[PDB]
Amino acid sequence: KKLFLKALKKKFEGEDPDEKYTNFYCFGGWEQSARKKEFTEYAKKAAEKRGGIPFYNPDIGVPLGQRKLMAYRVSGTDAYVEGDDLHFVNNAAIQQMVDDIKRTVIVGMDTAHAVLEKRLGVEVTPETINEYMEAINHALPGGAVVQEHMVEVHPGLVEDCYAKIFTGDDNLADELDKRILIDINKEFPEEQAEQLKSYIGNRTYQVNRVPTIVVRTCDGGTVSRWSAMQIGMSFISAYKLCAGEAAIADFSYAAKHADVIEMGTIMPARRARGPNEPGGVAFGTFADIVQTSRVSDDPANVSLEVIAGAAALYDQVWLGSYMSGGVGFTQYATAAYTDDILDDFVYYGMEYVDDKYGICGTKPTMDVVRDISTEVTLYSLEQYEEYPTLLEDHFGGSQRAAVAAAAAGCSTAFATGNSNAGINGWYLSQILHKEAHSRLGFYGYDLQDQCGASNSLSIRSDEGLIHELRGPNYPNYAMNVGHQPEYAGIAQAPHAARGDAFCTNPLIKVAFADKDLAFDFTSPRKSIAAGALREFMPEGERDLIIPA
Amino acid sequence: YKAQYTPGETQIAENRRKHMDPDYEFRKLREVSDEDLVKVLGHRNPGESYKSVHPPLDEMDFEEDIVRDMVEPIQGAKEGVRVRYIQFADSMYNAPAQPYDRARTYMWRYRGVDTGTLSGRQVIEMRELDLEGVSKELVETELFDPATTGIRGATVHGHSLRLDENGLMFDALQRYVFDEEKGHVVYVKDQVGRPLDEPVDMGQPLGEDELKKITTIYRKDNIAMRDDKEAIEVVENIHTGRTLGGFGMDVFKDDLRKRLGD
Amino acid sequence: PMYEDRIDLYGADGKLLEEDVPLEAISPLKNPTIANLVSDVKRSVAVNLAGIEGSLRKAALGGKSNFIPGREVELPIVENAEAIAEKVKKLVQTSEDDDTNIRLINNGQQILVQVPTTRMGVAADYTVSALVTGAAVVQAIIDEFDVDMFDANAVKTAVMGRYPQTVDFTGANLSTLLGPPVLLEGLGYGLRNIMANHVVAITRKNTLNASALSSILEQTAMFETGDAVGAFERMHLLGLAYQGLNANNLLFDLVKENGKGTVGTVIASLVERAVEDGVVKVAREMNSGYKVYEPADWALWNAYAATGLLAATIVNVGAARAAQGVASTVLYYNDILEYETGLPGVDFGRAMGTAVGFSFFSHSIYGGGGPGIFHGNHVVTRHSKGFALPCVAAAMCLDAGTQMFSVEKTSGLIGSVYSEIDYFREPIVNVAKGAAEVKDQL
Amino acid sequence: PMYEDRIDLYGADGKLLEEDVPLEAISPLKNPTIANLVSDVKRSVAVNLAGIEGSLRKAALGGKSNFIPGREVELPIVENAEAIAEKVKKLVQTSEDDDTNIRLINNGQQILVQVPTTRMGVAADYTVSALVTGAAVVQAIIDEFDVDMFDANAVKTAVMGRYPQTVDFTGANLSTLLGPPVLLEGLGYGLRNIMANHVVAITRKNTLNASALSSILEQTAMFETGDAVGAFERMHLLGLAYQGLNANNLLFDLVKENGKGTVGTVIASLVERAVEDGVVKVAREMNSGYKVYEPADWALWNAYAATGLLAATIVNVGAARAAQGVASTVLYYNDILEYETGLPGVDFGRAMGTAVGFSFFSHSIYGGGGPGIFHGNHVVTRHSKGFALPCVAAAMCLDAGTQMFSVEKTSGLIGSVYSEIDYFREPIVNVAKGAAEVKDQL
Ligand code: F43
Ligand SMILES: C[C@@H](OP(=O)(O)O)[C@H](NC(=O)CCCCCCS)C(=O)O
Ligand SMILES: C[C@@H](OP(=O)(O)O)[C@H](NC(=O)CCCCCCS)C(=O)O
Ligand SMILES: O=S(=O)(O)CCS
Ligand SMILES: [K+]
């Protein structure tokens, strides 16, 4: 029985799900909605603070709620909320997810340790490292270690700021302070732990999480710099160096350039941003940030969770604010993580693939891509045709295109273990979708759609790139909603199918296996739902330094 | 050369071909006066002369351009008339015309066309004079079900929704209403929602059964896409050609050989 | 020659220029006119003396309603344009014999400065021409009027704008067809950075000369980016030959036979001609009787399709004399062509994809603008590898006055400065000249 | 000639190469060796076949500890380097007679690819050489081993890295001495974008040839930025001649006579020589008896001061055989020189200012690094207009193994690929040759 049927039943209570007819214009407009009535009340109370400047007013322009205004179920949860509660401005959990990614930087420690021993004649032991890690957990949040008459950051404002360490060296890991260790053997299943260590070797990395209040006041480009400064101060302090000598410049260069792992890369001038902003986060990098892979053996579940997080990051926040703004793109995104709709399509595709090919059962060929993509797209289309309340739910073509093609693309990747086969399947789904309904998405939805097949397996200049390494700055992808979140899923899909510990970078995967993060990256869906219900506590609030 | 228009072995594909085929004349189902048409368009008053955006072509002086002067300008462009629009929502419950269907039809059949396709709306921007000529054909013929084809320049929500209690498509601004007495759809507002002094009667809705026969959308409870294997095959062929072309190494193998030669 | 293809070069008037030419004679790598054109594009600088004088007088420095009260400087610069131009020549040249060219524009209200190729030769990129011209104009003005040391930095600011506080010459009174490489979308995109209206102004609104100029720059850029390398080279050459240079009069004849036609009738004509020439053949018949076609020559099919594309643009936009429909035209030409035949569209979907975004961003709130401001270094219209932008150039030649951001508003001065350069203004006839000069040397 | 200045050109060994040469014969605008040098720098690409093969094998794609499990491709690329190089030649060349040059390095571990000047001539900037070489290598590998269509994009990724998701070739396995222009600090800074360790590797740690190459690149860049225009041209020519090319053996003699000396004693020697040569004169005496000096020739004084600067670097850093003191040396040479005389220091304070920041960012937490990673396109060391970086090159030649980021660690591969190119490795002897070739045609 269809996975979305439960949610549709509650969303359209007491209505015949087969009936193609319904009643409109009978709800009292916006007053049907508890959330809209709340909004209207706060707007009225705001007149005084605003000194009479006009504000939110439901009587301006369109009279919302001529139809019934839907609630949405966050997929996999019991949270039924009005869509407004999923808007990124209204959802502190979405905000904290973005900030947690933004404020994270990884730095190799072996190069610094080589500087200490070869240039400075200082010996590095597990004990000195434990001392160093204590120093930086004082320095990173803004505490002084070397100079007299330093002013300091209020600790109450930066409790989310800390540094941890992980290493492929099990013997070293056994000797480090457990309070600041990310333990690979503890956080990952045994076979995944082995795969990670086979790439990492016995190298050691620190994970620095800059204060949330800092990236909110400033930006992503602040983070690797903030990290590096206090790494520098901490080495000087813990190892009793001259506070400013030639060898110190090697620490800085390592921490800022040679040995640093950032979440995202810089943008071109037309859409200029520094490192660690969402546009620079490649799809496979985001897949590795999401932690579902190490707590679930269900490839559909791992992909679906990645897509939920990616919907919030790429469409709601990045495209819906950074690159545009206003009311924004909440429901372009929620289509990919509510009412268990995408789930149904994806689980259909996975079962189809498992029976016919087996999971990772065949080499990628165009025959296989055509077979799977066509089958899954047809099935997804027929669902919107068979259920009038489903079509009324995903009322925008872009939503329907993204969800159907995501199922097509992931399923293709599930079968072949190839992400580029996956997106080639995605583009087939789109033009097939278009012929079936004589429509697709919004005015400029299928720019990348029509360019897609040809560039999916291209090897030329700015066309060819392994899909995992593509991201929001890949030229065809730079502009439009309803693609990027799903591309993150497709990047994850073959690695989930393979049971890989990671998609693109083992260091990023390990760096977010951390219970002390505010956002729960093992399940983006559950955190977002908690934010929707206003049950999520974000970091970086300023109540301690402002009037009551 | 005998044009094919579109692939497919079902009636849906055939309906699309007939729309695009210029030698097929649309069946006229209803009468709409010029004045009512101008009124619903909401751009100007009936009786006033067309307004210009630039001087007439003969009052302007052009340098010689053989290529340009080989192309016949439409009447509205000759007279320098401003560009205006008409916009439809087409219900996914078998509206007689559908969005890309419209666009392909327009580009085969009309001259000087600017048309944008979207899931919830389809728009034409054209010289106002020529727009009115075109628009008449678009509302009087089988391309237009007053129940499932909404004229709307903004707040277009409805193509994906269930029909209302009277079988009419949702319109958040209710530019048309159901006349219970005659069983007619009547426009009481222009396409952007300005109330009309005198409402415009668009006639009776087409039957559900008639729409199933003439619609250009594939639906499972009518004719499913899955049943048109020919159409699917050609779609995949287009996808495949694009993929191999993008990769290039095989389809251009002879070109590469020469570059490598000697 | 490397390739076997031979072509006839026809002029914008539909008449034969040069018969039986090997394809590589119009290659950017071989054609001497294209070489000279690219060279001129990189080394040529427009200086706005009236702008400099006006900026100084108001202390309107840095552009965008910036004014710095009390730092005004009053100088009769335009009045002394000839003396200034001569000093600029002395500072810019490397010898009295080199190819430095200075030309007064609009009776000295503006200046065209062409920096010698010798300076370009020992520079990494093309910014040198603006940078050197900038330094020459600054010193010429300071020397000519003995500007006080404390006023002199206002002259510098008036000429070069906010640089170096800004990464570019924001608010400057000089310009180059190519913007600073620091603003490029993609590596090697320098020659793609020319707005369609500039192309139209430069060619004085002559339709095929505009599409030719755009095509020459786009396809030459495809060589710079490495897209026209190896397997792909012939595709881009044929694209340049047919779509850009009216090879075998195909473009001119598709338009001629569809003067009263539609996008649909242009497609019918094109497909028929393609079947006739053995470019395309039936692969199989479907149950309806629908014939699925396949290319017999993929690069050549793409060139034919691309030619029908520009023709359809000219027919549909020309009919409207309103350019806004160019994006729509490019989109549905390809959409209809594919379902008419089962063949891949122009540039294997990328021309169509570009037109989808181009449509969106010329009819919405999110960005873009009118069609005249788009170019190959635009995030919206970068995606087709040379096959879309020539349609935009052609379309703006045909616009009779429907745009707010028209050619005169965006590109008037630019037209006056560069349209004197004959290769810019009439590329087709001069490229054919270059082809004849080298065809036997291949 | 334009200027009256005559110089004797001396070699790195202190011996006369060329007598009575007009100053302009070493100008970047006239000297054929410098032109050829700049051309080779722009068109030369290092391809790391071993890197490509290794990246592909582990699917180590995009660099910085990136791995993509399941997308591994095993290919015997280095083993078939000769066949691949020949295909790259075929795809990169424009004719069999052009100046395309392909060379195997370390038995096929790498390939030096020098793209023909014909391709450079019709491209906007220098990125074309990497872009074309990249496409040629990708297609050469795919063709040689018949790589599966679904694996092929892994080869592209192995060669050109994360591009285009990144603005540059992040994690790529080919490289060029010049980075992409989109990463330039300032307009026209292309030739300044070579770290000092690369220059040392290229010149095989020979002190004066390293400072010469650095000087040649920096001053040539000063022509590109337009700084060496008009009033300023002679300043930069003399700077190149004396500081870079050991004009009149001044540089060589300052070091020789202070072999066991300090920065202070070099300054004494320099000031004596400048007074002796009438470059500088006493303007007035102060109450203490202190003499305030004045330039008799400002551009020539700057050239003399700049030469002593490099001498002081070689003496002080040479005594320590530890390069870290170069920043301090440049700073206090100028600081002491000014208070010794009342004359303006090298580049009128900008060499010193550059050294202040250089000192800071090579001894602190805030950024920078060791002296070997600095260059003219670095935010810290961009500020002097050609007169500081040659000291850094010289210093890294003299370092005996005190650095973490040593020449070997940063630039080992660069030495293998580019140091064979004679104009790169021994610029001084070859620039003088070029001077002799053109001295009479001026
Ligand atoms: C380690 C460095 C080298 C470096 O790269 N930056 C340092 C340290 C850095 C740290 C000190 C943090 C800490 O102690 O935990 C911070 C705050 C930057 C940061 N990482 O957040 C800083 N200095 Ni510093 N640093 C300062 C200063 C100074 C003055 C202090 C001279 C004195 O007699 O006290 C001297 C430079 C000088 O001599 O001119 C100085 C040097 C130094 N400064 C020497 C340490 C000197 C020592 O061992 O005490 N700073 C100042 O001159 C005042 C502003 C003050 C900054 C804090 C603030 O603005 O509130 C701080 C700015
Ligand atoms: C095209 C470009 O806009 P401009 O043409 O530069 O105004 C670009 N905007 C966008 O791509 C908007 C992206 C998000 C909004 C549309 C989502 S479908 C930008 O702001 O840099
Ligand atoms: C030099 C440069 O650092 P890098 O050498 O690029 O690591 C630059 N930092 C700075 O300029 C530090 C400025 C603030 C700290 C010093 C205040 S005196 C930056 O981070 O981009
Ligand atoms: O109508 S448009 O396609 O322009 C924008 C939809 S968000
Ligand atoms: K409202």
Side-chain angles (χ1 to χ4, degrees), chain C residues 42 123-124 139 163 187 224 229 231, chain D residues 42 123-124 139 163 187 224 231:
Chain C
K42 291 164 57 177
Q139 287 182 46
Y163 185 79
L187 297 172
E224 176 163 2
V229 168
Chain D
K42 291 164 58 176
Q139 282 180 44
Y163 184 79
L187 297 172
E224 177 161 2

Side-chain angles (χ1 to χ4, degrees), chain C residues 28-30 42 91 94 118 122-126 128 131-132 135 139 163 169 180-181 186-187 220 223-226 229-232, chain D residues 28-30 42 94-95 118 122-126 128 131-132 135 139 163 169 180 186-187 220 223-226 229-232:
Chain C
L29 306 178
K30 298 293 184 182
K42 291 164 57 177
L91 299 186
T94 65
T118 295
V122 290
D125 64 56
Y126 52 87
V128 58
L131 284 167
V132 165
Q139 287 182 46
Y163 185 79
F169 299 128
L187 297 172
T220 296
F223 279 83
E224 176 163 2
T225 64
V229 168
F232 304 98
Chain D
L29 307 178
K30 298 292 185 182
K42 291 164 58 176
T94 62
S95 73
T118 295
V122 290
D125 62 56
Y126 53 88
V128 58
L131 283 168
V132 165
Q139 282 180 44
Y163 184 79
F169 300 132
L187 297 172
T220 296
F223 278 80
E224 177 161 2
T225 60
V229 168
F232 303 96

Side-chain angles (χ1 to χ4, degrees), chain A residues 57-58 60-62:
Chain A
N57 183 0
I60 300 291
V62 64

Side-chain angles (χ1 to χ4, degrees), chain A residues 3 22 87 133 155 189 351 361 394 433 437 461 509 515:
Chain A
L3 303 185
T22 189
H87 196 292
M133 288 306 295
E351 191 190 6
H394 287 182
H433 191 138
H437 286 183
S461 64
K509 177 59 67 180
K515 74 174 180 176

Side-chain angles (χ1 to χ4, degrees), chain A residues 268-270 323-325 329 332 431-432 434-435 442-448 450-455 458-463 473 475-480, chain C residues 182-185 189 225-228 232 235-236 331 335 338-339 347-350 352-354 356-361 363 366 375 377-380 382-383 385:
Chain A
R270 187 182 203 92
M323 299 299 297
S324 69
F329 297 149
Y332 279 133
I431 69 170
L432 179 55
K434 179 182 165 184
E435 279 327 281
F442 73 96
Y443 221 143
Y445 181 82
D446 57 314
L447 169 135
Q448 63 190 290
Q450 304 296 342
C451 295
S454 66
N455 286 345
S458 180
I459 49 85
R460 296 207 296 187
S461 64
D462 58 15
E463 300 169 2
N473 196 50
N476 294 169
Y477 303 167
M479 291 152 290
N480 307 121
Chain C
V182 85
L183 299 189
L184 295 184
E185 276 281 318
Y189 275 25
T225 64
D227 285 334
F232 304 98
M235 155 167 57
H236 287 281
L331 203 176
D335 192 33
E338 287 179 338
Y339 283 106
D347 203 9
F348 307 113
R350 292 181 291 236
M352 182 178 168
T354 297
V356 171
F358 186 20
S359 294
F360 172 52
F361 281 107
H363 296 82
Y366 296 96
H375 50 88
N377 186 47
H378 200 294
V379 66
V380 174
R382 62 175 290 177
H383 313 278
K385 295 305 185 285

